[PDB]
Amino acid sequence: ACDCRGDCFCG
């Protein structure tokens, strides 16, 4: 996903 910062990354 892309919400947290370095864990829920999207790329």
Side-chain angles (χ1 to χ4, degrees):
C2 357
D3 295 291
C4 305
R5 53 193 262 257
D7 284 289
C8 305
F9 60 77
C10 260

